[PDB]
């Protein structure tokens, strides 16, 4: 059930496809900024992931192949550990970044930090922390992994 | 020549003849709120589960992604199946489809829990690799 | 000579099978004004008469020449010329609105949706029109600041990806920032029925913080913060304060 | 109609406003709130007019910050009017300022405010307290350095609850007349090329002025004249239009407005040694002096090479001695034209000024109720029937020979609101709305077919720029006999290129060449009918002022004591209003001159003033 100003604005719609009327372009043609980019980033994380908890519940669910067999298989193909911590660093990035941007958000929601200032140093701080808490979070166990390779006891 | 023909008003947004019908729709911001605290709640969630693992905290991501990702594909739903770019058959078939999407993916989840390693397992042995 | 030149989108309805193109002029930067507004003046005077846009004032106050330039939604008439002659710069219509012609946009709903919210005082007790003053503060009166200024020129509105998808659904940030205006308005009594208006799912609620109508504002203004705010009040998180009492002498 | 074909629609409205800045929005809500059927017919989106960039304020003797009279500013007003203006029209203006402001605060308009919250008031240009005696007043009541902006989108907003019905970017052809009478408008519609005949009972023009008709002024692109060339073409004589406001202080390169609130904050005039010159040309008043003086001493500061900058060409507006909270608090919107166009911090620096074409005291006459006359000797004053008009378009005259700062807003509203007050009087359900005569319209759209076909070899483009230099040029702030004729010779020979006029865009759908064709051929009538009068005028009063006749000539000598002199009839004094009668096909322009009218409209609320000699 809309309100008035939403039935007239659909009427205008058709209005305007029946008078044949192009649309002025958009995506293609407005400048690359640090703020829609930003929303692009959240919105592709935040669905990149959505979308693999589908392909994966329902994939490992449905197939015959269980999770361990597609571990092992992996393992078995001898990747060098680099590329498997760059893999890993790419799991973690979306996670970080969507949880600490989506604060950032709640934040513009609650019309905190909406100056321009604001919105680009806590652009940076959420991207920024993002790339650090991943590599963090990846380069830590393959160094104290190395560790215990070699670590005298 | 001016053998003409008698013309209408162009189309104008009467705001006050707008107000004599219409009762406001009930409110949403009710449901607003929830969905932004729930995320908030989140939070903690997820530096808690990079520590405490196993089965009783693959239920708590399992309901909390899913009740979280239900609210952000309806959202994504509603900005790129429109009526006007789609036809209202197939709006409606995928604001239907954002219903399927959390069903299958908490069924999926739920499956994966209970009959393989589940969700914080599951991490784990991609990052032993 | 520093000869620089534009890609101006063209469009010409009256044409049959006509298509969007783009167009390349050529404009001595030293027999031209400084800003956009006099190179597209220049070339519609001694190039090209067919070309077309709005304009009016020429200080940057009346809105009418909105459109895009180098990407970014700006006022032709305050928006320099970028000298580097090297480069072209792109002059598109304001983002996904239906064109007449050239540079010029339907308007339309933009205008409807600014009658829908109602954008005039209203006070519950009927006053005598001439009579007298009413009362209110310095301070609140300052909170119109950020918000009466608004000219009405659509780049904000033009550049949220939100409004892009549901114009016809989600009032946008140019309307919704005077929403808010009349909101705020300490002598202003229908606070409430305002947020009534726009309680739904879209209208004010399909603001996905994207902050480009913030960034994009040639008069520098924030109309992000007033969805916020709008937001806020929305949820019962804020309310509105209450007019400041009138003084018993006043 | 003759090469191409045209789709004409037919409306039928009570009454019909042409033009949505102040003054005619604000005749759109009273007509609209008293139940009439309202058309409001405009050729940009009404916020775009203006109005709009209005800066200073409006006046009205509130005593916000002060005590102070309607009657105190009843006597400014006259007194900037140089004894030109009319007595009933300018009282009515300033017994309704206080109501009509406070109209538009109660309509929503966001004044800056007092610490009583009160609405406040700056000082302005021209303005005492005490008949002339006491001090410079402070009547000026603004919304910072945006006044024009809130007043025109609260009036825009306020229109939308009185079911006006809002023609927008129709651009308006002739009125429709029919043996004497106004009824209605044509107009083309830029959205669809098609042509509209508008029936009313009434129709009000409120159009705006034709500052576009110089090369440098503060105005709209779109003051182009239209509305008092709608007047000439219906065989109406226009009124004073050589009385053209220099504002002081326009920016230097690029001719935008930088406030006389500037001045009234404080500000002054600086020239290349450093003096504030405004205390030699006006000891008391100094840089708040009368438009038409501050712009002059400007002038002659230049010609004698006090002028400043690169080619000593113009001089320095100073505030940087004010304090930032309060260039912030009072002045924003010039701060930053200041910084764009001229790159100056005005915390800092001083901003490059001169004086520049502003406002138009001149234009369709009317008696004080907003209605439209013609003037014979004979008859004296006779109404137009049907026909409405106010705003700067108009002429009441509430300015005669200056106008007078923050009284044009003042203007726009209280007459826009008298149109509608006269006409919900007046007009009685009794009379219906008039059927258009055959062929109503028929020469207008012949006039558009030839213009947007036009073939010769002038560009309408390079016609326009000759008729702007050539005016800026002849009948400029000083002007002189001679001067003067030449300048009515090239003027007329533009007039007669006109019909060697090359348009090239021959669609109908947003054609602007077109338009802007038929601007030029409006701002020509204008600038014809301007400078023909101008010519003539062997006197100086007001903004109009001559070099060979320097001395203001009244039925009087008002220097000397007035009882024992001898009355000089109507043919050798000049207080008296100049008429344009102009044939729009051959450019033949004829005079007349016409009597102002100095007797108040109540006695016992107020005395007329009597002439003296104009000093600030
Ligand atoms: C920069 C600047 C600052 C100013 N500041 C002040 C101030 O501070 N205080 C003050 O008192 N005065 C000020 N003035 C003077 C004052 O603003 C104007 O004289 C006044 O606003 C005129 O209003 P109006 O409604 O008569 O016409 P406008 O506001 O000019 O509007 C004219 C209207 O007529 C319409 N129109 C014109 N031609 C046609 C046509 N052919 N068809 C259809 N429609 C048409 C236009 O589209 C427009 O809607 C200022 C002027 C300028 C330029
Ligand atoms: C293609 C795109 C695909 C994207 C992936 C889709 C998956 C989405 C669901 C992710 C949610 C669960 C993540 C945490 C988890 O379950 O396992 C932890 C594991 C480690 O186990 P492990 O390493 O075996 O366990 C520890 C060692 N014993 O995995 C991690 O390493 C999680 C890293 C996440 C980064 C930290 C979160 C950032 C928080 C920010 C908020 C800050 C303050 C509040
Ligand atoms: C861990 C903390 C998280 C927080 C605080 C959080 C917060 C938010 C917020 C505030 C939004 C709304 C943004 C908008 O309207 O554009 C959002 C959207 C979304 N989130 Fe999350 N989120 C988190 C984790 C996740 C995770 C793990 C997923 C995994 C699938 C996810 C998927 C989504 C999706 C699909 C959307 C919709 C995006 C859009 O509409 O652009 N989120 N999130
Ligand atoms: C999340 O905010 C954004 C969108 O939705 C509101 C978009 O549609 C788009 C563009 C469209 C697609 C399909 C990515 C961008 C870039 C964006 O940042
Ligand atoms: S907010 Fe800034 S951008 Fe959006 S309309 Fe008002 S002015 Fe134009
Ligand atoms: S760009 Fe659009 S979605 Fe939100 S804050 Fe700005 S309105
Ligand atoms: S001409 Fe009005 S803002 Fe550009």
Redesign the interface.
Do not use: N
């Given at each position: 059930?809309?309100?008035?100003?939403?039935v007239?604005?659909?009427?205008?719609?058709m209005?305007?496809?029946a008078?044949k009327?192009?649309?002025?372009?958009?995506l293609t043609?407005?400048?690359?900024?640090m703020?829609?980019m930003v929303?692009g980033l959240h919105?592709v994380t935040?669905?990149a992931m959505?979308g693999t908890?589908?392909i994966?519940?329902?994939?490992?669910?449905v197939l015959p192949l269980?999770?361990?067999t597609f571990?092992e298989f992996?393992?078995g193909l001898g990747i060098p550990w680099v590329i498997?911590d760059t893999f890993?660093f790419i799991?973690a990035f979306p996670?970080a970044f969507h949880?600490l941007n989506?604060?950032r958000?709640?934040g513009?929601?609650?019309?905190?930090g909406?100056?321009?200032p604001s919105?680009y140093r806590g652009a940076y701080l959420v991207l920024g922390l993002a790339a650090l808490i991943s590599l963090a979070?990846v380069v830590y166990?393959r160094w104290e992994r190395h560790k215990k390779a070699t670590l005298p006891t | 020549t001016s053998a003409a023909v008698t013309g209408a008003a162009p189309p104008q947004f009467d705001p006050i003849a707008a107000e004599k019908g219409f009762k406001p729709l009930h409110s949403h911001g009710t449901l607003f709120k929830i969905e932004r605290y729930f995320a908030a709640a989140m939070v903690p969630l997820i530096p808690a589960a990079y520590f405490i693992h196993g089965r009783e905290m693959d239920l708590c991501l399992a309901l909390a992604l899913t009740l979280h990702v239900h609210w952000g594909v309806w959202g994504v739903v509603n900005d790129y199946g429109r009526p006007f770019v789609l036809g209202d058959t197939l709006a409606a078939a995928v604001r239907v489809g954002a219903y399927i999407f959390t069903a299958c993916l908490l069924a999926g989840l739920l499956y994966f829990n209970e009959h393989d390693v589940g969700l914080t397992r599951a991490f784990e042995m991609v990052w032993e690799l | 000579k520093r000869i620089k030149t534009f890609e101006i989108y063209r469009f010409n309805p009256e044409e049959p099978g006509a298509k969007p193109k783009l167009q390349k002029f050529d404009v001595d930067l030293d027999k031209c004004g400084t800003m956009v507004l006099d190179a597209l003046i220049k070339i519609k005077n001694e190039v090209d008469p067919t070309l077309t846009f709005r304009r009016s004032c020429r200080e940057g106050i009346c809105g009418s020449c909105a459109m895009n330039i180098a990407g970014e939604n700006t006022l032709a008439c305050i928006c320099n010329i970028d000298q580097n002659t090297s480069k072209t710069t792109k002059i598109y219509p304001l983002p996904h609105m239906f064109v007449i012609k050239d540079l010029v946009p339907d308007m339309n709903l933009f205008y409807a949706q600014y009658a829908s919210i109602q954008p005039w005082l209203q006070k519950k007790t009927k006053i005598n029109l001439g009579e007298k003053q009413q009362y209110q503060s310095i301070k609140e009166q300052e909170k119109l600041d950020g918000l009466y200024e608004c000219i009405l020129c659509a780049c904000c509105s033009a550049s949220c990806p939100s409004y892009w998808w549901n114009a016809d659904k989600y009032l946008g940030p140019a309307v919704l920032m005077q929403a808010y205006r009349w909101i705020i308005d300490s002598r202003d009594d229908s606070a409430a029925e305002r947020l009534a208006r726009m309680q739904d799912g879209f209208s004010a609620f399909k603001c996905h913080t994207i902050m480009n109508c913030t960034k994009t504002c040639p008069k520098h203004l924030n109309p992000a913060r007033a969805i916020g705010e709008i937001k806020m009040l929305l949820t019962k998180m804020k309310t509105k304060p209450a007019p400041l009492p009138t003084p018993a002498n006043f | 109609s003759n090469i191409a074909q045209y789709k004409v629609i037919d409306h039928a409205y009570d009454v019909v406003i042409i033009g949505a800045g102040g003054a005619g929005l604000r005749a759109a809500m009273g007509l609209g709130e008293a139940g009439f059927k309202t058309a409001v017919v405009t050729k940009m989106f009404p916020t775009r007019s203006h109005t709009t960039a209005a800066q200073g304020g409006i006046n009205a003797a509130l005593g916000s910050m002060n005590p102070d009279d309607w009657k105190w500013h009843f006597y400014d007003t006259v007194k900037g009017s140089d004894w030109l203006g009319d007595q009933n029209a300018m009282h009515y203006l300033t017994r309704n300022a206080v109501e009509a402001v406070t109209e538009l605060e109660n309509f929503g308009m966001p004044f800056s405010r007092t610490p009583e919250g009160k609405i406040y008031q700056r000082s302005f240009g021209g303005q005492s307290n005490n008949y002339g005696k006491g001090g410079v007043a402070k009547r000026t009541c603004c919304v910072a350095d945006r006044t024009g902006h809130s007043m025109l989108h609260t009036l825009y907003g306020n229109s939308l609850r009185c079911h006006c019905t809002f023609f927008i970017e129709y651009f308006a052809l002739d009125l429709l007349m029919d043996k004497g009478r106004c009824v209605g408008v044509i107009a083309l519609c830029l959205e669809d090329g098609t042509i509209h005949r508008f029936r009313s009972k009434r129709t009000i023009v409120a159009t705006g002025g034709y500052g576009r008709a110089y090369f440098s002024c503060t105005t709209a692109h779109m003051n182009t004249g239209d509305g008092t060339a709608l007047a000439t073409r219906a065989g109406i004589a226009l009124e004073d239009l050589e009385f053209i406001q220099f504002h002081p202080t326009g920016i230097y390169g690029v001719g935008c407005l930088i406030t006389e609130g500037s001045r009234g904050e404080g500000g002054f005039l600086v020239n290349s040694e450093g003096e504030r010159f405004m205390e030699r040309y006006a000891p008391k008043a100094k840089d708040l002096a009368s438009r038409d003086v501050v712009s002059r001493a400007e002038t002659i500061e230049i010609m004698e090479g006090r002028g400043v900058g690169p080619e000593k060409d113009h001089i320095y507006l100073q505030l940087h001695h004010l304090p930032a909270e309060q260039l912030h608090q009072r002045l924003p919107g010039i701060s930053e034209t200041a910084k764009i166009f001229a790159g100056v911090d005005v915390t800092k620096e001083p901003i490059p000024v001169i004086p520049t074409v502003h406002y138009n005291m001149g234009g369709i006459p009317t008696n004080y109720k907003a209605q439209v006359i013609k003037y014979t000797k004979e008859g004296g004053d006779k109404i137009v029937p049907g026909l409405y008009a106010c705003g700067e378009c108009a002429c009441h005259s509430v300015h005669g020979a200056n106008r007078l700062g923050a009284n044009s807003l003042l203007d726009a509203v209280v007459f826009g609101r008298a149109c509608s007050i006269n006409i919900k009087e007046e007009l009685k359900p009794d009379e219906k709305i008039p059927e258009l005569p055959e062929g109503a319209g028929e020469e207008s759209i012949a006039n558009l077919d030839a213009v947007r076909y036009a073939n010769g070899d002038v560009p309408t483009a390079e016609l326009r720029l000759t008729m702007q230099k050539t005016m800026q040029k002849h009948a400029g702030v000083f002007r002189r006999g001679d001067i003067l004729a030449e300048g009515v010779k090239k003027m007329m020979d533009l007039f007669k290129e006109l019909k060697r006029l090359k348009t090239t865009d021959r669609s109908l759908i947003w054609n602007s060449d077109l338009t802007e064709s038929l601007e030029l051929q409006n701002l020509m009538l204008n600038a014809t009918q301007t400078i023909v009068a101008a010519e003539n005028r062997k006197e100086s009063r007001g903004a109009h002022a001559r070099d060979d006749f320097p001395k203001r000539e009244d039925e009087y000598d008002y220097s000397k004591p007035i009882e024992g002199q001898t009355k000089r009839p109507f043919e050798k004094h000049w207080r008296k209003h100049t008429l344009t009668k102009q044939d729009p096909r051959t450019g033949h322009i004829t005079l007349d001159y016409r009597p102002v009218i100095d007797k108040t409209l109540d006695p016992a609320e107020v005395d007329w003033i009597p002439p003296i000699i104009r000093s600030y």
């Open positions: 059930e809309k309100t008035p100003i939403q007239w604005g659909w009427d205008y719609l209005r305007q496809r008078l009327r192009p649309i002025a372009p958009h043609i407005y400048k690359p900024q703020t829609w929303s919105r935040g669905c959505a908890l589908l994966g519940g329902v994939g490992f669910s269980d999770f361990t571990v992996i393992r498997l890993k799991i996670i949880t989506g604060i958000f709640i513009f929601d609650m019309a905190k909406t100056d321009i919105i979070v166990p | - | - | -």
